[PDB]
Amino acid sequence: EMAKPVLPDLSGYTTEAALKKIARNKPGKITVARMMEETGLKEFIGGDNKMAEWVVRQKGIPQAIMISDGYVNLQDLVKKVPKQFLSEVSPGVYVARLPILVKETGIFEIDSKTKELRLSQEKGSFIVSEGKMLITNTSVNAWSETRNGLAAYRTPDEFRPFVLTWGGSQTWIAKTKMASMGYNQSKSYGVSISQYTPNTAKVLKRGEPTGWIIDSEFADMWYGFYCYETRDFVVKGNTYRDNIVYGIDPHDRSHGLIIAENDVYGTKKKHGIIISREVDNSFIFRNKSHNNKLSGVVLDRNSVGNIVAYNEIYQNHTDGITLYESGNNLLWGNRVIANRRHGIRVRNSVNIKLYENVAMANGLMGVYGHIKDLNDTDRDIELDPFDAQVSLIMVGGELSSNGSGPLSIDSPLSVELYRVSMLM
């Protein structure tokens, strides 16, 4: 029978290791120049004819603070950039009134000497990196100058500052607090790690972005974390609290992700943790995901080869774990407790392995498997094909005290159960 899963070692993912990640070897170059000259900005904004909203924010032809050709820290920028674009309002507290772009050859650091970097909401500030970026022991917040405080969430389409990295970038964020970033706009969700668009990528062929986000805290974000075609990204030891749509939302053919020892709660609209659209060969382990508006943890749209292990998943307002059209995944030793609906729900997914899971005191079923015809729904069948079959193997663990019974599997292709405890 099956041995317990081998999970990636996390012991090397620390702030001291993050600090040693960059070359502070060669001093870089700082410029303030036109935004629309740069791919890093064109890629998500579009051409010259889309620049008007940025003209309005900056009250002139849109500029960015740019770092390239080596190493620049935030203190270096403050010395070189005019006060009107980057101002120290009190010791170690700075307001950026332009976007900051780390270009491909650029290396950008923020460290403990910075108490807070405030990104101006009104001026349209944000951070985009194509290079290397290291943020440790500090705060970076979306800031409303008119409110004189965080840009607290109000509505989906209102611009809020954000962080965005592109193909070929490496990014390390440790012991850092960020709040109030992101909104309902492509690449602007909050903290977004992303390969270039298909057209640009095929020309640039930069390699998929990567990096770490460790021991940090993200609050009031549109998405706490997002990625697209990203490799080997580490999200470890963080608190994702009171974010709007999702806590952690890896997407679109990302793979090898390590999502571990995070505490994710209070998500206002949807799921605590969701991987969607061929997020494959990843690891979701020892997280707490609780008190989210929908599910604790979701595997969606043909996300396969994953290991979901030893998570505490509880008090979510719908399911503990939901699998949507995402087969060939292992769920091992999760404790799924007191979610309002089902403990573990599996829809249209085959070869699901449920080993040693404990599903207790959920409002509905401990485990629920079903099929559903998704044709003539809003689903894009070409992009996200599906098959209306469900099958699973359950070994060990416990299903007890669930509101509607230990399990229901409607129309399965096959179910096998071995040595599952179901207390009566």
Strand pairing report for 127-129 and 421-422: unpaired
Q: State the Cα angle at 111 between 105 and 113, rounded to 5°.
A: 130
Residue 133 burial class via C-beta count within 10 angstroms: exposed 0-12, middle 13-18, buried 19 and up: buried
By annotation, the residues acting in catalysis are 251
Distance CA 402, CA 158 (A): 42
Q: How far apart are CA 404 and CA 23, in angstroms?
A: 58
Domain count, the chain: 1
Please give the full DSSP string across 96-158, using - where no structure is assigned: E-S-EEE-TTEEEEE-TT-SEEEEETTTT--EEESSEEEEESSEEEEEETTTTEE-----TTS
Separation of alpha carbons 85 and 253, rounded Å: 37
Domain that holds residue 231: 1-424
In which region does residue 49 sit, left (phi positive, over 0), alpha (psi from -120 to 50) or beta (all else)?
alpha
Containing 77, the helix (H) or strand (E) segment is: helix 74-80
Contacts of residue 234, defined as CB under 8 A and 6 or more positions apart, other chains included, come to: 13, 211, 212, 213, 214, 257, 258, 260
Quick one: tokens of 205?
């062929």
d(CA 342, CA 296): 11
CATH number of the CATH domain containing 368: 2.160.20.10
Non-local CB neighbours of 205 within 8 Å, separated by 6+ positions: none
Q: Is 402 exposed, middle or buried (0-12, 13-18, 19+ CB in 10 A)?
A: buried
- Kind and range of the H or E element at 323? strand 321-324
